[PDB]
C-alpha cells in the first residue's frame, strides 16, 4: 500500500476512482487492476493505461485502430508510460513502474482503450 | 419523416438523435437504424429498444444478462414495445410498430442495451 492503488473496471463501464496521487517518495507505483462482474473481455474488456493528457487521445485513437489482439494498444506506444493488459471479468493484472518515469507539473490521465470506455473510464493522476 | 425517422448510432455510443416526437394521426411508426464507423457488434453493437421511461432500467439489466447471442435483449421481455436487432457498423434494421401501443401521457425512453451504452445511447420518445 502507499505506493500501490486497487483499481476496478466493471460491468457498467467505470473505474471505482478517478484520481490517483503518486507520493514523491515513492521509488516505484503499482496498480492492481481487477474486474468485477459477469461479462467476457472481448464484450466488456478493461485496462489501466497512463500517458499525459496530451498524449492520451492519440493512445486511445492508436490503440483502437490496433484492436483486440493487441490488447487495443499499438505495441511500443511510446507515449504509454504504464499500462496493465487488457482483463476480462473475474480476471486481474498488475503494473509496477518507476516514479522517475513522472514529473511533477505534468498533468497524467489513466484511462480504459477499449473502444468507446475512455468516455467514462479515465481519471487523473498527478506526482506530488 | 412522415411517421418514420432514421437514426444512427455511431463507434463514440452516441445516437444521432434524442428525442423523437411519433405522431398521433399515424397508425405505425418506423425508425430505421444504421451503424456508421468500423466497429463489429461485439465491441460496438446497438440496437434501438424503446419501452416506458419507468421499465428501461430492468429491460437493461435483464438484457446484459441474456448474452451477445440473444443480442442483449431478453426473449420475449414483456415490457419491449419494439426493438432491431444488436447490429455492427455497415449493418441496417428497421422496426414498425403500431402507436396503438403507446397511450397519452406515459413516458417512454428508447435506448440501447449493448453492455454500458444505456447510459449514453438513450432519449425519449413522445406521441403527440
Ligand atoms: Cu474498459
Ligand atoms: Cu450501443
New interface residues.
Partial sequence: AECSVDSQGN???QFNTNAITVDKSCKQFTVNLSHPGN?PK???GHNWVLSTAADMQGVVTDGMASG?DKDYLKPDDSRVIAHTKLIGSGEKDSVTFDVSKLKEGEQYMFFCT????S??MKGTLTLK
Same sequence: chains 1, 2.
Avoid at 114 to 117: A, E, R, T
Fill in positions: 460491468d457498467q463501464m461479462l472481448n464484450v466488456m483486440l477499449f473502444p468507446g470506455h468516455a467514462l
